[PDB]
Amino acid sequence: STGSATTTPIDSLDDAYITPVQIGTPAQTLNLDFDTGSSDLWVFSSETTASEVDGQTIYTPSKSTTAKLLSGATWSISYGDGSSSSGDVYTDTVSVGGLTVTGQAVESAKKVSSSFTEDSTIDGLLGLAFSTLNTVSPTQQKTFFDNAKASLDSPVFTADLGYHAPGTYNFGFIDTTAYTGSITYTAVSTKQGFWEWTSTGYAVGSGTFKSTSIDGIADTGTTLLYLPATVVSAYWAQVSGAKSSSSVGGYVFPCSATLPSFTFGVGSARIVIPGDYIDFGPISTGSSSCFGGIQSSAGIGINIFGDVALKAAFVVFNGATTPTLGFASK
């Protein structure tokens, strides 16, 4: 089997991407944030605290003939941006782009933090990291990909995120029309439950490539590119007037700037992030200070190849017995 679904930016900055997901019988379509950095599929639901719902589409398991309470199961998760959610668990039929999983754990939110309530465009998350990170207790549950894997033509999924434009998540096949050149594959460590890999270095703009190992995760659920402070300082030093603002919470730059590109290494290959991808716009409405799309990972504890990086590539998440990651230009 295969699946193919379009993923769409939630706003003009590509702060996140939503992908339609069919849950239950008859189908209830919710727009979920596909997240290769977590492993829970959770949704706003009829069980969510009413004051914490503001415009989201909810899953109502009582209206699904295939929903079943997973008795005794609860879940609770915190994300890198400080947001959180928790609740109980149903199993139900879940389809993504024509690919169906029966018996998928659908984690129903009883509580969500303010960041979720305040974003009316995201109805939940669909985790695509390794199932070892799933938070369901007392019986850990498998991700949608893990459940689908054995039925897939090939045990892979791909992320093809757009810059200010829709893109595609495919399951079970590699669309050879979706990228240019060749795909370069690189080793993954699953030891922390992430799609963790080592970039071979970087360049700033038209500058020379610096060979250096940068361990990080491929994370579709993180907006920005978080890298070591040395790297990030070298990037922003090339933008006149750029500075790190403790008050804003990262590097800002004059909105009048033309940003240089940033290149990262995948083995002997190179992925070039155009400068425009690194512009996240005014820090507040009407400001001439703009927020940078490359930020320091110092104090995160891990480097994160988030959307800013991934959208510059066609990315293969190869879930074979020994997983790997593939990157191509596009």
Give the chain as a 3 state SS string.
Answer: CCEEEEEEECCCCCCCEEEEEEECCCCEEEEEEEECCCCCEEECECCCCHHHCCCCCCECHHHCCCCEEEEEEEEEEECCCCCEEEEEEEEEEEEECCEEEEEEEEEEEEEECHHHHCCCCCCEEEECCCHHHCCCECCCCCCHHHHHHHHCCCCEEEEECCCCCCEEEEECCCCCCCCCCCCEEEECECCCCCCEEEEEEEEECCCCCEEEEEEEEECCCCCCEEECHHHHHHHHCCCCCCEEECCCCEEEEECCCCCCCEEEEECCEEEEECHHHHEEEECCCCCCEEEECEEECCCCCCEEECHHHHCCCEEEEECCCCCEEEEECC
Contact 111, 52 (CB under 8 A): yes
Resolution for this experimental structure (Å): 1.4
CA of residue 218 relative to chain centroid, distance: 8
C-alpha span between 146 and 41 (Å, rounded): 12
Contact 44, 57 (CB under 8 A): yes
Experimental method of this PDB entry: X-ray
Q: What are phi and psi of 234, to 5 degrees?
A: -60, -40
Contact 42, 75 (CB under 8 A): yes
Going by C-beta distance under 8 Å and a sequence separation of 6 or more, which residues neighbour residue 322? none
> Given the structure tokens 């984690």, which residue do they identify?
107
Using CA atoms, how far residue 40 sits from 168, 182, 186, in Å, is 21, 32, 25
C-alpha span between 145 and 110 (Å, rounded): 24
Q: Strand pairing partners for 294?
A: 225
The tokens for 286 are 């009407």
**Domains of the chain (ranges plus CATH)?**
5-174 (2.40.70.10), 175-330 (2.40.70.10)
What is the strand order of the sheet 279-282 is part of?
243-245, 250-254, 289-292, 279-282
The tokens for 4 are 């193919």
Contact 11, 121 (CB under 8 A): yes
The tokens for 74 are 């609860």
Among 41, 38, 151, 56, smallest CA distance to 90 is for 41
Among 87, 59, 91, smallest CA distance to 75 is for 87
Using CA atoms, how far residue 102 sits from 42, 61, 110, 162, in Å, is 16, 15, 23, 30
Contact 119, 17 (CB under 8 A): no
Q: Which residues participate in catalysis according to the annotation? A: 35, 199
- Residue type at position 207: G
C-alpha span between 154 and 145 (Å, rounded): 11
